[PDB]
Write a protein that binds this ligand. Structure first.
Ligand SMILES: *[C@@H]1O[C@H](CO[C@@H]2O[C@@H](C)[C@@H](O)[C@@H](O)[C@@H]2O)[C@@H](O)[C@H](O)[C@H]1NC(C)=O
Ligand code: NAG
Ligand code: NAG
Lengths: 379, 383
C-alpha cells in the first residue's frame, strides 16, 4: 500500500469490464486506481530528470579587475586611444574632462580620457536549455498487497519504477506476482531553462533568464563577455585618472531573485501528464485462494484517512493460510458496497494484513471472518 | 585664480553686495569695481553626525537549528525558541499517518527555528536639515603662478555654513574681511538618507531605503533584534519531520546593483556633491590691495602662450622686468581703447614670480596693451 494519508490524492475507479484506466499525474498528487477483478494500484509521479541538458548561456556573477590602463589627451590632441580597447577581455570607457593650465595642458577645453580594465570572471552560473526530447519521468506503481510495512512507507523498493520519455512514451511494467501492465503516456509542454549555479539547481522561464542583468557568454567555444559594464563601473577621479570599481558577487541577488522559482540531475515538482493503464496482462494474486475460516484479531486500531476511508491492520488464527479475507460492511443491516483493497489475502499467519475500505455514512459495522468493528463516519 | 577653465562656470557682475547661486560642480566669478574679483565654489557638504534611521542586514548566518513535530490531533508544535528574538521560526502542516510514525491520519504540525545572527550589515542615517556644514571656497584673483587652475592644492579660503550660523566673516589675507549670508532654506529636510555600507557611502531617498527588502533593526547600538528575518532565511520542508534552513547569502552585490542608479557620495561621511545654496556677499570690509600702488613702467614679455578658456576669455601669463611692486596696465584695442578685465588689479608683487591676467577679448582681431611705448601687442581672432 502507498499514498495513504497523502493530501492531494485522487480516487480514479475504472469502469466495469474496462481493461484500461485513464489517470492524471502531478508530483505531490497520487492516484489510487481500481478496476473490477483487478488489483488496486497506487500510481505516483516520483521524479522528473533532465539528461544531457544543452548549454544556452553562461552568466557571470562575480568579476575581478586588473592591469588598469589609462590614456589622457590635451584638448585638440586627439581622443585617447589604447590597445586594450581592441581586446574583448578588457572593458573600457571614454569621457571628456576640463583641461587647462592646472592639469598639465597648455590649452583650455575638453580633453579626452580613456580607461580600460581587465575583465575576468571568477565565479559564474550556468543556464541550460532543456529540450523536450531530454525528459525522463519516473513513475512508481505500488500494488495493494497488504503487507504491514508498506502503508505509507515512501520507499521505492516496494512498488516498481517505470521510466517514460517523449521518445519512448509507452512502456510495459512487470509487477512481481501480479503480471504485466501497459502504460501509454502523453507528455505535454512541461522554453524553460535549468540554472546550475554553484552546485544548486533551479528551473526558471526562458525570458526571465535572458533578461537577467548579468554579463553573459554564448554556449560555444572564445568566452567573450557581453554587457561587461553590469559588473564593472568607472568613477572619474580627476582629469588624469578614471578609476575602476567592481560591483562584487551577485550571488545574494540571484538567490533573492530565485526565491520565487521551484527548487530541485533530478527535478521534483514534476509536470502534469495524462496516462492510460492497460491491465489485460495484470493478474490479481490470490484469485484462486480458499476463504479463511479462522478468527481474526485487530492488530492495529482503525484509522480514518483524510478522504473518509478507514484502514484496518488485522491478524489471523491460522490453519487456513493462504486465504481470501471475508470482508463485509453492514450499515445503520445490508451488505458490501465498496472495498479499496481489491483482494485482501493472508500471505502468512504471523504477518498482519492491512485492508483499506470506504465505510458508508453514519453508523456502520465492518465484519471480517467473526470480528465486528463499529464505526461512525460523520455525515 | 581658482575656477579657471572649469566647464560649468558662471559670471556674476556688480554695489558692495552681490547675490549668487552656488552648486557643487558649478562655480562663480564675482567682480565689482574698486573691489577684488573672487572665485566662489561650493566645495563639499558634510553631515555632522546623523542619527541612524535604520540598520539593514546584508549577510546572515544560521545555527542551532531546532525542530518540533506533532501527530495529527496532537495540537500545534511548540518550542521555547519561539520565545527568543534571535530565533527565526516557521510553522507548517504535513501529511501524517502510519508511514511516518503516527497512529492517526491527518495533518500534523511542524515547527522549525534557527538562530539568526548576521556577519555584515549596512546602516542608514537620516540627514536632518540641522546637522549640515556647507564648505564654500573663495579664491582671490591674485595672479600668482601657483594658483592658475590649482585644484591640486587648496589655495583659497573656505567658509563654514550651518543652518544655525548661516552668516560668516572670512578674512582674506591682504584683502580684508568678507561677509557671507547664505540661506540653506531645503531638499525635503528628512527625505535623504546616508547609507553607510562597509566603508562606502551613498545618498538615497527615504522611501527607496525603507522599501529595501532586507531585515532591519532600530539604529541604536548590542542585542540587535532583527525584524523581517525571512528575507534572508527560507525554510524548505523535507518530508514529515524536518524543515531545513536556507540562507540567502551576501546581499553586497545586490546592494551595489541597486545603488548603481543613485549618485555615489565619494567619502564616508562627507558628500562631494552639495546642492544649490543662495548666498549674498557683503564687501564693505573687503580691501582691494594695490590701489595705492604705482603704475608699471618696464617692458613685459610673455611667459606662456596666450590661452583661450571655454567661455571666450583669454589668459595671459607674463614676466616683468622695475618698480616692484607696481600695477600692470591693461586694456584692449580692436581702435576701441576700452577693454573689460577679469583680474581687477593686475600687480607684480615680485619680479621673478610670473603674473597671470584674465581678460574678455572683444569679438575679432583685438590687441592687448600690457606694458606702457614698447608694450607688447597680441592678436586674437575671437570667432
Ligand atoms: C518500510 O518497509 C521496510 C521493509 O519493506 C518491506 O518489508 C516487508 C513488508 C516485505 O514485503 C519487503 O518486500 C519490503 O521491502 C520495513 O523494514 C520498515 O520498518 C517499514 N517502515 C515503515 C515506517 O513502515
Ligand atoms: C599586467 O599586470 C601585471 C601585474 O598585475 C604585470 O606584472 C604585467 O607586466 C602587466 N602586463 C600588461 C601587459 O599589462
Ligand atoms: C599648484 O600648487 C602646487 C603646490 O605648491 C605648486 O607646486 C604648483 O606649481 C601649482 N601649479 C600647478 C600645479 O600648475
Amino acid at each position: 500500500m502507498r499514498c495513504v494519508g497523502i493530501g492531494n490524492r485522487d480516487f480514479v475507479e475504472g469502469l466495469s469490464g474496462a481493461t484500461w484506466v485513464d489517470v492524471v499525474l502531478e508530483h505531490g498528487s497520487c492516484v489510487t486506481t481500481m478496476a473490477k477483478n483487478k488489483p488496486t494500484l497506487d500510481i505516483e509521479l516520483l521524479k522528473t530528470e533532465v539528461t544531457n541538458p544543452a548549454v544556452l548561456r553562461k552568466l557571470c556573477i562575480e568579476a575581478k579587475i586588473s592591469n588598469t590602463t589609462t590614456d589622457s589627451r590635451c584638448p585638440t590632441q586627439g581622443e585617447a586611444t589604447l590597445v586594450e580597447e581592441q581586446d574583448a577581455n578588457f572593458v573600457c570607457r571614454r569621457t571628456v574632462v576640463d583641461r587647462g593650465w592646472g592639469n598639465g595642458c597648455g590649452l583650455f577645453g575638453k580633453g579626452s580620457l580613456l580607461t580600460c580594465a581587465k575583465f575576468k570572471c571568477v565565479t559564474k552560473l550556468e543556464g541550460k536549455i532543456v529540450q523536450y526530447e531530454n525528459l525522463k519521468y519516473s513513475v512508481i506503481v505500488t500494488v495493494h498487497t497488504g503487507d504491514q510495512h508498506q502503508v505509507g512507507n515512501e520507499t521505492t523498493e516496494h512498488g516498481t519504477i517505470a521510466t517514460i520519455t517523449p521518445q519512448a512514451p509507452t512502456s510495459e511494467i512487470q509487477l512481481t506476482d501480479y503480471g504485466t501492465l501497459t502504460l501509454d503516456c502523453s507528455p505535454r509542454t512541461g522554453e524553460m531553462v535549468l540554472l546550475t549555479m554553484k552546485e544548486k539547481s533551479w528551473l526558471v522561464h526562458k525570458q526571465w533568464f535572458l533578461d537577467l542583468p548579468l554579463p553573459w557568454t554564448s554556449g560555444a567555444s572564445q568566452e567573450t563577455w557581453n554587457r561587461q559594464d553590469l559588473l564593472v563601473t568607472f568613477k572619474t577621479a580627476h582629469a588624469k585618472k578614471q578609476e575602476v570599481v567592481v560591483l562584487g558577487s551577485q550571488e545574494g541577488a540571484m538567490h533573492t531573485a530565485l526565491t520565487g522559482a521551484t527548487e530541485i540531475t533530478t527535478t521534483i515538482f514534476a509536470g502534469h501528464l495524462k496516462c492510460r493503464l492497460k491491465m489485460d496482462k495484470l493478474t490479481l494474486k490470490g484469485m484462486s485462494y480458499v476463504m479463511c475460516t479462522g478468527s481474526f484479531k485487530l492488530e492495529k486500531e482503525v484509522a480514518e484517512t483524510q478522504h473518509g476511508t478507514v484502514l484496518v491492520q488485522v491478524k489471523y488464527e491460522g490453519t487456513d493460510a493462504p486465504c481470501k479475507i471475508p470482508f463485509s460492511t453492514q450499515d445503520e443491516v445490508t451488505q458490501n458496497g465498496r472495498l479499496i483493497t481489491a483482494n485482501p489475502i493472508v500471505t502468512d499467519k504471523e504477518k498482519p494484513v492491512n485492508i483499506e475500505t470506504e465505510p458508508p455514512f453514519g453508523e456502520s459495522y465492518i465484519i471480517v471472518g467473526a470480528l465486528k468493528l463499529s464505526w461512525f463516519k460523520k455525515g
